[PDB]
Design a protein around this ligand. Structure first.
Ligand SMILES: CC1=C[C@@H](C(=O)N[C@H]2CC[C@H](c3cnc(N)[nH]3)CC2)n2c(=O)n(CC(c3ccccc3)c3ccccc3)c(=O)n2C1
Lengths: 254, 27, 10
């Protein structure tokens, strides 16, 4: 996270750390949507151009972590994957369009004060909360800065970010933005910064329903041009836009 | 349900240090 | 930088 702060213990019970067995390394973020399914971006898994194609056995999902590095025993739980499902129409070729992926747990994960799922948005909530100016919150153990001169943070990081208008998003970049993406961050005019960085991808972009006090995942951290650059915005999978899909595999495959 | 109601906060009726900000933003 | 995780996970 660029310009964030140390999160609070228990602050993001849905926070999933997608771990790599050899080498032992942070790979991405993800979120716990149920006792069996984790939610992530496809790009953490499949990026042909980067020779990136991870399989059910390359990864380890550690939930309930706080510390970036320490094996937090009796607190965190390392779990094994059944299957990975990538959106059939994910577009790594052109705009990373449909950057979504479901990961299935080998066994149900026991909820604790540290392990708790976030909700998926419905039409009405998605409707009333997904509006510009409206601040979401991003969490992850990614980089503090785009490149670090002088995988960085001690603990899970936090940053709250303003949802930006389409046309603003579209002006920002040269990439073909789609209905399935959304952008966030402070305009170069608002003297305020922060963003998701490298190692923050696939993690959750959540906002709180002033109606029910529930926290909802509105987006998955996607692509961007560097981290925290003036005039550019961070891009996000439109979680509610792809719900028909989630809903579908989740019941095809249980 | 219980989805999104955090046992260390929303459950003991406690607020986290930066949540205010949000709620305020849904102005 | 990561601390080693219990072996049965690997
Ligand atoms: C696995 C990949 C993930 C991601 C990444 O590394 N992303 C990096 C960069 C910032 C990102 C990020 C920062 N803040 C948010 N919200 N996301 C997280 C880490 N990605 C890119 O953004 N591009 C570059 C990008 C681009 C090209 C030309 C001009 C502007 C942006 C691109 C996006 C989508 C398809 C192809 C290229 C690319 O080739 N990949 C591959």
């Amino acid at each position: 996270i660029v310009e964030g702060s140390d999160a609070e213990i228990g602050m993001s019970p849905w926070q999933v750390m997608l771990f790599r067995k050899s080498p032992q390394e942070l790979l991405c973020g993800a979120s716990l949507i149920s006792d069996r399914w984790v939610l992530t971006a496809a790009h953490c898994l499949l990026y042909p151009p980067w020779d990136k194609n991870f399989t059910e056995n390359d990864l380890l999902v550690r939930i309930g972590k706080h510390s970036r590095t320490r094996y937090e025993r009796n607190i965190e739980k390392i779990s094994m994957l059944e299957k990975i499902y990538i959106h059939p129409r994910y577009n790594w070729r052109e705009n990373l369009d449909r950057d979504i992926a479901l990961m299935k747990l080998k066994k149900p994960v026991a909820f604790s004060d540290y392990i708790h799922p976030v909700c998926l948005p419905d039409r009405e909530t998605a409707a009333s909360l997904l509006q510009a100016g409206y601040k979401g919150r991003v969490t992850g153990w990614g980089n503090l800065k785009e490149t670090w001169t002088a995988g960085q943070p001690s603990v899970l990081q936090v940053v709250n970010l303003p949802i930006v208008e389409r046309p603003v998003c579209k002006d920002s970049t040269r990439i073909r933005i789609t209905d399935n993406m959304f952008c966030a961050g402070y305009k170069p005019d608002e003297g305020k910064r922060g963003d998701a960085c490298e190692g923050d991808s696939g993690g959750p972009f959540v906002m709180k329903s002033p109606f029910n006090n529930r926290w909802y995942q509105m987006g998955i951290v996607s692509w961007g041009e560097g981290c925290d650059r003036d005039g550019k915005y961070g891009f996000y999978t439109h979680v509610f836009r792809l719900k028909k899909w989630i809903q579908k595999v989740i019941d095809q495959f249980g | 349900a219980d989805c999104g109601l955090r046992p260390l906060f929303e459950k003991k009726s406690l607020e986290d240090k930066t949540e205010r900000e949000l709620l305020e933003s849904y102005i | 930088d990561f601390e080693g995780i219990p072996g049965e996970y690997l």
